[PDB]
Amino acid sequence: PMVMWKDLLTGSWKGPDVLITAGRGYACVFPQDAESPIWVPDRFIRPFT
Amino acid sequence: PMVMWKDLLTGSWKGPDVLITAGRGYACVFPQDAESPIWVPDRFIRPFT
Amino acid sequence: PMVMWKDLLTGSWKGPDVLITAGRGYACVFPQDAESPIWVPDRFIRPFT
Amino acid sequence: PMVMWKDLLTGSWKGPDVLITAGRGYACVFPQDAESPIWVPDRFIRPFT
Amino acid sequence: ALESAQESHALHHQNAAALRFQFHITREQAREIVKLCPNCPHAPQLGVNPRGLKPRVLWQMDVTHVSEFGKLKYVHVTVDTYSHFTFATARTGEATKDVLQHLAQSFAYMGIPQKIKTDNAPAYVSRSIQEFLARWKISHVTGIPYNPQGQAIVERTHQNIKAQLNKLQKAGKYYTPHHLLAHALFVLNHVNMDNQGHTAAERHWGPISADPKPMVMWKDLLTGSWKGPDVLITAGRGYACVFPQDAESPIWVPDRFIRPFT
Amino acid sequence: ALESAQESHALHHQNAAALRFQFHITREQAREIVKLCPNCPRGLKPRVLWQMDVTHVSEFGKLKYVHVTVDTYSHFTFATARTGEATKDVLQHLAQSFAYMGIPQKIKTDNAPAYVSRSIQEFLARWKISHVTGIPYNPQGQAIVERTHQNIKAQLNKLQKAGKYYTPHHLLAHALFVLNHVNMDNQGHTAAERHWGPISADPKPMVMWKDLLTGSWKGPDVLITAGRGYACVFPQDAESPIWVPDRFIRPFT
Amino acid sequence: ALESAQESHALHHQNAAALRFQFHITREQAREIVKLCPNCPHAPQLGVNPRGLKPRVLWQMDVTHVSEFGKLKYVHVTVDTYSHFTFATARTGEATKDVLQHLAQSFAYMGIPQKIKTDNAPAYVSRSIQEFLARWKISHVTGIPYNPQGQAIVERTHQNIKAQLNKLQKAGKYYTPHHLLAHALFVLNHVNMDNQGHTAAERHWGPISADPKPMVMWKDLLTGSWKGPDVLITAGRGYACVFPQDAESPIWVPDRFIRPFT
Amino acid sequence: ALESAQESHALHHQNAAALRFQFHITREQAREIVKLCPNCPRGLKPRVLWQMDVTHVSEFGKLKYVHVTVDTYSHFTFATARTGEATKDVLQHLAQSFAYMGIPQKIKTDNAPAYVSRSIQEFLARWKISHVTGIPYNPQGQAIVERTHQNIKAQLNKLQKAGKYYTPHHLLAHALFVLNHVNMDNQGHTAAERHWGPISADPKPMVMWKDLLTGSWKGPDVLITAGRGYACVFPQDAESPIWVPDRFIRPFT
DNA sequence: AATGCCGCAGTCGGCCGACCT
DNA sequence: AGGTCGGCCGACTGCGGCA
DNA sequence: AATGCCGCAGTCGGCCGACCT
DNA sequence: AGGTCGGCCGACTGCGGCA
Ligand SMILES: [Zn+2]
Ligand SMILES: [Zn+2]
Ligand SMILES: [Zn+2]
Ligand SMILES: [Zn+2]
């Protein structure tokens, strides 16, 4: 599965990207483009496709 | 798992079929129909009965 | 003009007496009692009857 | 009558000051310290005394 | 007594609630104690930005900064406040002639108002603008300096235009900045339909129509009292308009001052 | 009143119809105002078939390529003083005409490359606009563009007595404004009005309004509402509705 | 059909409402058409910052910048998330020893938690801090980097502290910055009373006076379904907590996911 | 378990009572833990009468002027290592004691100028604190401060085996923490606890908790709620309440 | 001298169609 | 033929963020 | 690797006291 | 003695702005 997601740090809107997990106020995204998993608030996650 | 969902595009109940995951009130439905995964709003989910 | 107001400090109706002005739901009550003008919430105003 | 009032331009909170008028979303404050009348919106006015 | 409540308040600036329990006083007594505190500095809906009663009455105008096009960022925007009919011109500045360019175009695009409201920029204050207004016979409101809400209709419109431009730019390439902009304007007034099934253009120049309205009680903040009841002209998200037989002019207030009369 | 009729005539030079409908001028008097001026000698639905053409306003000399789109129904004229006859110049004009006029069902152009391009055909497909080839030239289509070009130029000529424009676009836009929003037909309607098409079987009542400031009936004006012995009418040039004791109102039929 | 609705949407990015009327489709169909727009882009209440279930469980800590005192602007702040019991230390920096100073003081002032949450600053990440946590046996949460809401309790507290310091400074002169601060802390926990008639200190060290609670339906966003009904533990402005027999741990959610069961 | 009892003893050096109440240690064993350690040899309401005193902790030498305030009820000790005995030093200390302890009904000091100042008297009026003049010396009041100073110093001496403090304040604060929040009396209560005064006729039921992970009874623990055949109890060191089948719960009396 | 707004996309309640009784 | 239920659709609402 | 908050000060509805019937 | 009304008070809500 995949999602869209806001870059909490710079504010730039990112995605679509590799959805790893989510729930209870959080989400995890992780492309192999990234060095490590993207751990963000679920308020910035949109249900891509 | 095998859950049925209202076809967001026609209204017909589809499945029950391969649900991949869920979160934030959505259900990422995605069987072998590679055309698109579908995050279906939870209210339209009716698990295999 | 001569209007009566609930004593915001004791609850007793005071006056009717010299109202200077009003606006935004308040009534600036101010007779010769130089101790303080009083913007009384409109709901506590009862004009001379 | 007198009121407190926020400096719309710099954001500094001003007052207490000379109330000239008010109503329908607007107000006027005008000390002789000022060159001309202070025309501000009701939303920044507090019922001083 | 209250004197000691005030004393304690002056000393520690004690919470009104605490004062109630400590001094065995009412909430309202406690509220006055803290209200009279000059050292103790809340902003609920109060005013409202009014609008025209029919198309071509009151327009609102301001500019923005669409950095995407460099110098062309100076987009001039005019909106019919009644119908929310929008118009924009990507100029390369804010010169008198850029204002006038936009205006000329807006006269062809929108038509002609009875009055127009702008901000307090010199671009509108200038005698040359006032001259133009005198020639075309249009009233000019500048609003309160530094209060962006005087231009709230066009600012909200700017959000819409911006978003529209973003979507459309992502959708493909355009020959010019104006090609994109025109596409957006087209959509905003002729494609984008409201919840009544009508377009902005349609509202701007549609058939004269009106629906019957109920009487409501109307609170006048200058008297602190409920007046009427009388037939409400209109309303929308957060606002309402009424014009009584005994009133001098139409009354625009927030809709929280409306109490539907039985 | 007619002093200001003359004033606005000097400013825009609108026709006799517009002058008299606004100021209640004797048709003859309105014509007098005009002749004394130093520069003043289809289907059933709008947005269906548009007539396209391009001219050469030498007065500009650079923007002379004025692209023109005319609603064959209302005769509404939209024009863009372009720098050439490229397919992109056409498309740019077209995009602008969408903003001003909207999207038609079909458009009639000539057979120039400026319209032929498949990229344009693509756009026509995108906007579901059927193309009329312009091959069947005749006095109807010709009169549409001929009258249009003459009318445009006439207004532009009128504005040569007030050459206070910075660009050709300031000039043209002003002209187009008058042409579509100021000048009136014999029924008092404008080209824009007709183009828009709000004119239909309007069920709203109109009343004669005794303007008590004059002691006489004006209008008829569209009535908005009524109650408690007064009627709320909203006149053309009024800024707001006016409550008037019912006895001074005359339901107009 | 929907194909042409999508076509037009792709072309102009037409309003879902407009699509409904233009193509004679349902709202939800129109909504999906616009939802699938890759070039098109709302943030309702979703997450919630949870808190301790009793005093001395979860604390929250961060710093602020009270520029009034120059170097002393580095005020370290710790709050008991259960009782909202606050503590602050005006230090001249964010060194290990300044963090520690505050901590030492907060151990004497507040006591000791099971766990504490800070932001992701190096001032807390440092091994030496991690050592202190090992010495004192306290769990450490850092939250998501750059998301200020992870420290929302103390940030909200900072507003209160700031305001308290302001009104007290207006009230007179103080011997030291600490004189002022201590006065503020005094008020915040021992003077300022809540709407239940209790002080923050009182709540912090008061005995667990538990009240009986009703059963509610609880929506789990990971299943998209209503569960229970079961007894709600607590709630407040915008939030709620429930802990079912079949649950692994206490559940903190926004109170819009609560539906009181009859 | 006792290994960590010993660990925390090394860290804080809490008394035998604290050790055994937390770890369920034989009183004798708890005393053994203590003796083997290299540095371990009123009215009815709190916040009423406080005992004030100042000492000279030469170990600091600059902050040696430790101002001390003791709740005569709970024997809670608050202290501020000041740089002198000025009236402002006293007031600064006092302000800090308000934050930690609160405001009393009266405070007993000696007759030093450090307390005499009318500015202090003013402050006492502001806070309605009656002043006990402390003119006579009395073994009772003397024992309060004597025991206090000895206890403070004892803890400070204990912490000399782990002199890893940046300031005297880091050291003292740590000491005070242990003195008021860690050490327990014969009933398992702390000075802070007593100072606070939450202890009263607590109507809440406690239950024995069969901790099924061990298969044994723990507590008794304060019961929070119950339903559907399970009870929700929340133990001292538990992070959260625990649902346990009623049959494994014993209403404790 | 005048004064916040409105689209998004969820969410609730009601009206009507279909189907069970 | 009347009653029960789903669903189908309008109506209304928290939210952010333009200056 | 976890997740907005809560005081201000208005505003509404309800409960109870006083006084009229 | 019961009914009507004021008022007296708790409870709930839009708002802003902390980072
Ligand atoms: Zn105060
Ligand atoms: Zn003329
Ligand atoms: Zn789109
Ligand atoms: Zn020891």
What does F93-117 look like in DSSP terms, one character per residue? HHHHHHHHT---SEEE--SSHHHH-
Find the closest chain A residue to B34 by CA distance.
Answer: A49
**Nearest 10 degrees: CA dihedral of B10, B11, B12, B14?**
90
CA dist F156 and F59 (Å) reads: 10
CATH fold, domain C2-47, is SH3 type barrels. (2.30.30)
Residues F222 and F97 in one domain: no
Tokens describing residue F159: 């504005």
Residue A49's closest CA among F6, B38, H186, E75?
Answer: B38
**Measured between alpha carbons, how far is G84 from G28 in angstroms, rounded to an integer?**
44
Please indicate, yes or no, whether residues F99 and F127 belong to a single structural domain of this protein. Answer: yes
Return the SS3 of G146.
Answer: coil
Question: Where in the sequence is the domain holding G149, given as residue range(s)?
Answer: 58-205
**Same structural domain, E123 and E78:** yes
Burial class (CB in 10 A: 0-12, 13-18, 19+), F29: middle
> Can you say whether the dihedral through the CA atoms of E197, E201, E203, E206 is positive or negative?
negative
Q: Are residues H79 and H190 in the same domain?
A: yes
What Cα–Cα distance (Å) separates residue F249 from each residue in A47, F215, H162, H193?
A: 61, 12, 100, 85
Judge if H20 and H90 occupy the same domain. no
Rounded distance in angstroms from the CA atom of residue F117 to the C1' atom of nucleotide L6: 83
Q: Are residues E78 and E200 in the same domain?
A: yes
Would you call G252 an interface residue with chain H, using a CB distance cutoff of 8 Å? no
Choosing among 3.20.20.70, 2.40.40.20, 1.20.120.430, 2.30.30.10, the CATH entry for A2-46 is: 2.30.30.10
Grouping H, G, I as helix, E, B as strand and the rest as coil, residue G202 is helix
Q: Which bases on strand L have an atom closer than 7 Å to a protein beta carbon?
A: 7-11, 13-19
Q: What are the tokens at G39?
A: 């070039």
The amino acid at G9: H
Contact at 8 Å (CB) between G171 and G67? no
Distance in angstroms (rounded) separating the CA atoms of residues E254 and G102: 49
Q: Tell me, yes or no, whether H40 lies in a domain.
A: no
- CA separation for the pair F191, A25 (Å, rounded): 58
Q: Which 8-state DSSP code applies to residue H182?
A: I
Six-digit token string for H99: 């934050």
D2, D22, D48 ranked by CB distance to C24: nearest: D22
CATH number reported for the structural domain that contains residue G240 in this entry? 2.30.30.10
Q: What's the CA gap between E158 and E75, in Å, rounded?
A: 10
Check whether residue F178 and residue F219 sit in a common domain: no
Per the structure, the count of domains in chain F is 3
C-proximal residues of E, 143-202, CB under 8 Å: none
Using CB atoms within 10 Å of the CB of residue F237, give its burial: 0 to 12 exposed, 13 to 18 middle, 19+ buried.
exposed
Ligand nearest to the Cα of F15, by number = 2
Q: Which CATH superfamily is domain D2-42 in?
A: Integrase, C-terminal domain superfamily, retroviral (2.30.30.10)
Same domain, residue pair F98 and F18: no
Do H14 and H133 belong together in one domain? no
Does a structural domain hold residue H41? no
Q: Listing from the earlier edge strand, what are the strands of the sheet with E239-242?
A: E251-254, E239-242, E225-236, E215-220, E258-260
Experimentally determined by: cryo-EM
C27 vs chain E: nearest CA distance in angstroms?
8
From residue G184, alpha-carbon distances to E7, E208, F144, G75 in Å are 17, 63, 83, 13
Give how far C44 is from chain E: nearest CA, Å: 9
CA distance readout (Å), E169 to C16, E99, G9, G12:
67, 26, 14, 11
Give me the DSSP letters along G48-99. -----SSSSSEEEEEEEE-GGGGGGGEEEEEEETTTTEEEEEEES--SHHHH
Long-range contacts of G231-238 (CB under 8 A, 24+ apart): G231/H225, G231/H227, G232/G258, G233/G53, G233/H241, G238/G45, G238/G48
A23 CB-contact burial (10 Å; exposed 0-12 / middle 13-18 / buried 19+): middle
At F11, list the tokens.
Answer: 């400013």
Neighbours of G79 (CB within 10 A): 27
**For helices G177-186 and G152-171, what crossing angle results, to 10°?**
110
**DSSP per residue over C15-47, as a string?**
EEEEEEEEETTEEEE-SS-TT--EEEEGGGEEE
- Residues E180 and E243 reside in one and the same domain: no
Q: Which residues are paired to A29 by β-bridges?
A: A19, A38
Contact F119, F64 (CB under 8 A): no
Q: Answer yes or no: do C24 and E223 touch at CB < 8 A.
A: no
**How many other C-beta atoms are found inside a 10 Å radius of the C-beta of residue H107?**
23
| Residue contact E210–F225, C-beta within 8 A | yes
Q: Which nucleotides of K are covered by protein (CB under 7 A)?
A: 1-11
Boundaries of every domain in chain A? 2-46
Using alpha carbons, list the distances in angstroms from residue F113 to A14, E173, E233, E242, F108.
Answer: 43, 22, 55, 58, 14
CA distances from H82 to G75, H86, H192 (A): 21, 9, 22
The answer for C 10-49 residues in CB contact with D (under 8 A) is 20-21, 23-24, 26, 28, 30, 36-39
What is the distance in A from the centroid of ligand 1 to the CA of E3? 13
Resolution in angstrom units: 4.8
d(CA E175, CA E99): 24
Whether residues F24 and F53 share a domain: the answer is: no
Dihedral sign (CA F196, F202, F208, F213):
negative
Contacts by residues G24-29 (CB-CB < 8 Å, ≥ 24 positions apart): G26/B11, G28/B8, G28/B11, G29/B8, G29/B9, G29/B10, G29/G2, G29/G5
- The CATH number for E75's domain is 3.30.420.10
> Are the C-beta atoms of H69 and H78 separated by less than 8 Å?
yes
Do residues F117 and F159 share a domain? yes
